Amino acid sequence: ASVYAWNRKRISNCVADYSVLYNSASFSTFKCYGVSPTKLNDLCFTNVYADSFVIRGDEVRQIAPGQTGKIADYNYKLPDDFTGCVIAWNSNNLDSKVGGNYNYLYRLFRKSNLKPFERDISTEIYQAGSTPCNGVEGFNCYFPLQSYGFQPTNGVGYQPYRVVVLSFELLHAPATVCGPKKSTNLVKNKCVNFNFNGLTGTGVLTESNKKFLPFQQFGRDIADTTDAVRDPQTLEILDITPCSFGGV
């Protein structure tokens, strides 16, 4: 969509891989400002919000946490305390007609700065004075939208660039979109250090014959000592025993 109509989308009830983003070297910029980008897929957030648009070459640096500017003042207000990430890549191959791609419009003049994370499409020809600008433009009446002139002859400062911004939240309600994790191969008959679904321990784990109700995971004892465990990937029953200790 255009700059003035930057679409705002939310994502919920999934697992966000982020793997394609970190190895993304064909796209020019993947810059996360709020948190370290590489160590993000290993953490969780309640929601993630994506705002997508195609902007100027100069405006690429303008949409940043705390960074202001023309589009950053009139078309996209990013708050100072914004923790998020920005993805940007040149799209002059598609977003440039031979005669000029004029599907993209931007407003640059509004009498009052827009609130953060708000989309406003008031297309009234700006009324500067007390005269009514009801389709009458010029002095004290400004035509509200300028079309993006996207041509190959335009400089790097005025080139089309596809840019999306991601905002991460973890809120009082329990989160949904946590990051994917990796499961190592199973090991039997050795005092290893095991971690099943947050439960942690050290011991030797062997095959079992205990029968579990189809909804149960753990298995414990009289004195609050975990004894059996159900394997989370494929379903089995494994007893655990602390590896041998004694007196010499």
């Epitope: 255009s2 109509a5 997508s52």
Partner: antibody
Framework: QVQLLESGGGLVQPGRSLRLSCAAS????????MHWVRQAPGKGLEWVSG????????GYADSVKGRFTISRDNAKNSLYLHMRSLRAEDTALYYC????????????????????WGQGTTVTVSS | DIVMTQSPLSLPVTPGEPASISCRSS???????????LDWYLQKPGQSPQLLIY???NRASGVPDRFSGSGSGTDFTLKISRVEAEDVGVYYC?????????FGPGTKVDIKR
């Protein structure tokens, strides 16, 4: 039930603006591309404008390039169509239409196939 | 800028012969991926507009299977072999490739006498 509420009726003189609003009921706004098709009497249907499921404007018509504008409202499930500096030669009946194709139907984005039409209004571009 | 045409404008049909109207385009409508991007539209006089056919060969829901928009490149023909009494209507063919999107002339098939 899928109900199309079209608002913005009234009389407009050439040289001024216009604004129509589309409201949809019975289905999710974001899943389908929304198009505008007009049809003057004694002539068939003709595409006038459109916008994809991603609220991406598709362009402007050959006859009226530079003055029409189209926008979506995914927050309130609404749609705006604004007519900048109309002329008496633009007089016709406007029509709002919805797509069909379910999201991620595989190899381009599903944005075509208008199916459902209500009715427009009494747009008369005369002074 | 992209002209699509229908022919003939109106032909009178009776049960016993197919209803066949040809659409002529300016673009190659058989896309180079095994898929076509030409759609077909119906208008019943006195009722809200309808579709005919998805992408030339995909069959729409709510419509009879006798609708067939077939051909190649720019040459297509809408053929209905079996027509029931209420199939009096206006017809369009519409391209799904680029802008401006073109609707063909709306051909009126009415009652022959």
């Amino acid at each position: 039930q899928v109900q199309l509420l079209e608002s913005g009726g009234g009389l407009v003189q050439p040289g001024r603006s216009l604004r129509l609003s589309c409201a949809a009921s019975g289905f999710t706004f974001d899943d389908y591309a929304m198009h505008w098709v007009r049809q003057a009497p004694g002539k068939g249907l003709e595409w006038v404008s459109g916008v994809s499921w991603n609220s991406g404007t598709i362009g402007y018509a050959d006859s009226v390039k530079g003055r029409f504008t189209i926008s979506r409202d995914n927050a309130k499930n609404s749609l705006y169509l604004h007519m900048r500096s109309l002329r008496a030669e633009d007089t016709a009946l406007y029509y709002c239409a919805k797509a069909v194709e379910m999201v991620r139907g595989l190899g381009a984005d599903p944005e075509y196939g208008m199916d459902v039409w209500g009715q427009g209004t009494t747009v008369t571009v005369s002074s | 800028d992209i002209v699509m045409t229908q022919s003939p404008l109106s032909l009178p049909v009776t049960p016993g012969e197919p209803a066949s109207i040809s659409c002529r385009s300016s673009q190659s409508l058989l896309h180079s991926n095994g898929y076509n991007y030409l759609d077909w539209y119906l208008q019943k006089p006195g009722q809200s507009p309808q579709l005919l056919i998805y992408l030339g060969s995909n069959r729409a829901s709510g419509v009879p299977d006798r609708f067939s928009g077939s051909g190649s490149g720019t040459d297509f023909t809408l053929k209905i072999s079996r027509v029931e009494a209420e199939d009096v209507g206006v017809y369009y063919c519409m391209q799904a490739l680029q802008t401006p999107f073109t609707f063909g002339p709306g051909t009126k098939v009415d009652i022959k006498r």
